[PDB]
């Protein structure tokens, strides 16, 4: 230490001890991790029931579920959605002899843990799991046997033993609900998705944190519990009703896709970035688009038209010119360019969608060894939307063109994708189609704003970098302070949450416009939790 | 179920862990609430918000939204990364009574370095920060968007125990913008002269207001920054009237005003070192190795271009180049410019060329496209040959040309403005400090030789990318009074005197001729004391 | 029609004041960051001792040990291994008049703070230091001499002033025990490793946070001490002697690699990821699985079978078939296959485990100019074990085979890696080795299971990607509470922790079954810190 430091310091002031503190004595515990095998019941829906009963468990928290996924045996193209344990979650339900205490849907369990990237990896994020595999002979391994871990994010986990969920001498029960393994499978035509189907089996576990606690001293406490309102199809408005204490409120967007097979023309697998969405589509394309053969190339349909690259290397579709130039290509064979790969149009001679547009510069190097053209570089202006596209809006009744001038191999190659999780009206949720919000708490207009500054707010205040346009009412630190909420008023009609979006215009003949949408309106709702406690006297019959 | 070993191992005062009484909080309820500014305007642009209601009784969570317009025309765009950040240039919260807390936009940006979430809002995509290019004059370059700078304040420590109160008064957010050059990179294509005329700061401040029922305000401490620049090269700087401070913070950061702030590469969206490299050799390749028929044409009469020998190896005196590419037509040959960029203050001495900084160029030359497509590269180019400003190359002090590149790979050049750029590099990478001694009035407060106050302030704030830092104040903020370095008035100790040691460069290496500047930054305690208005009193 | 009312607020007793503090004045104290150089004593073991003496340094925290590594000049291959300063540390330890107050095994250290990112790369993490540099002429700079930071993380942290070390007029002794340079070195047999493990030096210098605190009032605490006990090679069980007060306990596996001459064919540099270690092993084995020779490839052993590629470009390996297709080959040259590049088999007639079967499709383009092949696609199913596998295992004993059917050249490219803190049997510690885990107190069962879910709570409650096996007791805030421990019943004979595992079952035909496994136990037991007559631990019994 120098002697400045020494002469600042060398009076009697009531001063707080910043160098040491008393170290209280806390309630004699004791933890234990707790793993308990369910019962399986079957829409055929399946379900599990976990019941905890035990004299010693006093309190739990940190709700784990185990999953074992099978092998996976085979022809085809197969893979599991990423998140693959979140996404297999449907509903999950807390409950005692009184009633359910907690209860969340698979998807806000699944928003809840969104920004936490340990329960997201150990729910199966893997190039073992979610890349699209192919099976070669009918008893080929696609996927090999793997576990799974699911963190069931409860309100019992924010300050540990302070917030656990106290266990009053009672029997306390954990029902799972699943959704149907197709939503969690990426998979082609070749792939035998029937037998699977009918084979497959959810094997589920259910661990916890358990304390064994001498003489507690237990507390009444409150509960946030969410509530979910999905909005009419393709309606911008959604209702929350009997609102009398509420701490936030989000509002977000999701795709229906039940008017179509649930057809995907290209998926990038383990890589999620919007990049890879974006190349793994330019990459499937590219084997139809950019030909080179011997003549015209054969095997489309008759509607394509394959056009010849000229000597200058310009292909001229409309306005848009695409360069093609393509090195080592024998003498006999010449350079084609499918100007109409996908396209669409409501109007005969009116604006058309062309994919093939949608590129401007095509370069490689044809391989005369694989018969293959080996592409160097791309320079295109293909968007997250494109790669969203379910392949029946492209065949679909209002398109005046044939749609789909892809080769069958291509068409072959298609992927169903039944991801119960999607948000907006692409795989990434990049598109905003919300260009104002409107939240009413009866007739008073609570809340507006044009730009998704909520969103901001949300991901600011969460530390999340995928939020939703979230109001919060809270600011109170949680289990040490009662919440904060939007109290009710019965007698104004102040009793309910009125949410009005107004959705972008989209244009009439780009095939994003007839994928339908719904408002996702997400209400928590204060509860008090309480601890009951009597003589109850009865009749022997 | 638990097992029995547990069991068997279970009037002393225990504190309970299981449970909690859930106090009732104070009456409050909490709004997102936006406003728009009035803009005034060296004609420098400034947003002045005013926020008053008697509903709003405190606040916190400021968030500015930046509305970016559609860039159209003709010539390479793009802006810097964190663009929201980085076109503030203050930011001043004030009162009838004074300014409360302010802050200077290079500071604001430091302090939100280590969060990655208000960084991306502020502006950090492909869409913004790679350098698009426009080939008509009524293509979009850049399509519209909206930019969330998060203003990050004392106010938001403790969330709602932190917050500003406002005592009955007005309270004005004053946002004053750097010019829209800072924050564009761009060539000379692009028509600038009209875009600067046409460009406007389209800002709207957001902020969590709440509505406080029968608030009990008591008084708090703030620490207000204070920011001071030392003179162009100078190893000294002083930081007065220092009575009470919690911290003092020590960087430098490179000076353009004497070069046209034109670089020959840029990135974009990808900001890794290797990313900047990588960008500089894709850059230089195409006038480096030449496939032509015959003595390449194009070049200056000073470029010194050689044929590369049946060997492959061409030497550049004491350098060995590796030159081999693949399908050369049999009319054109292999060419190395053995000379692209070179550096010297004397005609027979050292010379710094940045054509023996390669060692091994493979490729393939494509007869389709008339181009040599390269395979891969050895090197030795550094963070800092990006980061040379091409003025430095073509100065008085050079002996040489300089710049012997084709008028096309000149033409490419992009003008960098970014106003928050620390230390010789983009990336900050060379430290050129070699000793800091810090001086409280006459004696020695602190002297390190190696970084390690800059260690301490990366571990201490879990930041990657931290400064010379001393921390006087390891008492936890809010709940306590901030500790501080006391001075003595009396015994002359009252300011802050920063001495660094610059470490010594070649005269030979244009990076030697970028201007350096000192910044010394000093956190100084107030008291905030809300009797007849909101007011702050420095601590003396 | 487009206005919307913007109104404030819509939605509207003993009562906590949430919007306002009493601003405490806190203990009058002055830090200063104190550098020290110590004291270098050399079995030959490397010891730094440094002592910290003065009346003005009433407490400290916050250590963190500087290293000059010098400038590494001459021939060969050579590299540090990723964060350099953490794996030179074999022992710190904090000491007193009294005694030891706190000490921990390198690999320990490097654990707890596996997790902090900012502390791991001042340690060492950039591709200056960990690529694999090559120096080409006897006074070529290898290495450029840098300075490392290692944040020896303390339990004096924890609470910053409040937890910090306090000196009660006593000397404080800080001993720093090194690993041979061997430990933190990746090398070839090129570089003369034996002149520079004698010129080597440690250069260290001991940095920490150092507090003058006017009228101290010190009071006394509570710390957790890490105890390490290494089971037997190839043991499954280890067992933790005198346990009386412990906060938790980790398990995990470590190789042993002295059965071996630490040679590994491949190393990725600074890249860390799986995929980058797989990469550069198929990178290394690439230039003799597909030769473009003038008739039979000459320099392998008779024991290889080097086929040449057939018109129809597939060459069939038993059941396993290898597409190979190279273009631009010369008229006098034809393209081969090594059908056995590494193999393993225990029995002349038995399953033989062949790396050239691991490929499926390998294409490029033979470049004239630089007489190579330059690969395009690689399709193989290589993992994270093949890049672990010592050379040495290859050519065991125990195969009946070669094993190693490499060039001399690429023999002579492996790599020297002796890194101290390997967990598992591969480099990325992503296989599992555990089948059972049964932890015991006494003779009584304290915990046992067969999913790694000890490992899955680690992980979560820790937010770390990288977690052990570990059970914790103590789930109460540090610092403000006294910790919670496993207390002893020593009449009872629960006085001691016995770990038992139960190790996966491997193939013999495998190189990997004969990678010789250590149990690694960790026990973090509770002292009481007096500060009676100067600073002192007292074990809690
Ligand atoms: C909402 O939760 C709050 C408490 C109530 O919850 C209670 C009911 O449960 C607690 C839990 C679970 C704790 O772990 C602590 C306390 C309490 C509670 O009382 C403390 N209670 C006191 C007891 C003594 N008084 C007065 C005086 C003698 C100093 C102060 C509080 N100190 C306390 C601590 N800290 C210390 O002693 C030490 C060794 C250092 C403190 C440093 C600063 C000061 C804190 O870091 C500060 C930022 C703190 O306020 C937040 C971490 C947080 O507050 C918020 C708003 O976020 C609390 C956890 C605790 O660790």
Redesign the interface.
Known sequence: ?????????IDS???????????????????????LSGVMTNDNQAIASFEIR?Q????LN?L?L?LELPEVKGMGRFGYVPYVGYKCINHVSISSCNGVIWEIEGEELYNNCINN???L??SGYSSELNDISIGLTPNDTIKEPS?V?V?IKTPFDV????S?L?LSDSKITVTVTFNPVSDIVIRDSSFDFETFNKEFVYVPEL?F??????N???????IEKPRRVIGQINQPTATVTEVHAATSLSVYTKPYYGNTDNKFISYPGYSQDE?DYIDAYVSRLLDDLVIVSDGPPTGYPESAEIVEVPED?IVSIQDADVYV???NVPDNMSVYLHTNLLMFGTRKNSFIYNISKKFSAI?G?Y????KRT?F?HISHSINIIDTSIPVSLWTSQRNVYNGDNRSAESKAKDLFINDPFIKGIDFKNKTDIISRL?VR?GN??????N?P??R??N???T???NGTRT???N??PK????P?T??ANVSRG?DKLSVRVVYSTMDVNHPIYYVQKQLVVVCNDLYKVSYDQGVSITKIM
């Open positions: 230490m120098n002697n400045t430091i020494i002469n600042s310091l002031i009531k001063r707080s001890n910043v160098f040491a503190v008393d170290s209280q004595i806390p309630t004699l515990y004791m933890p234990q991790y707790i793993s035990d010693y468990i006093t309190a940190h784990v185990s990237t340990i329960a990896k150990h576990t871990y963190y300050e540990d033993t302070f656990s106290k661990s944190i358990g304390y064994m606690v001498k507690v001293q237990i507390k009444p406490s409150f990049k290397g130039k393509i090195d370069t190097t391989s005369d060894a694989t080996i160097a409107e708490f008073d207009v609570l809340y507006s704003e730009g500054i909520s901001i707010y991901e600011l205040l530390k999340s970098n109001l919060t009412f600011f109170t289990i040490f302070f009662r904060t939007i109290t102040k």
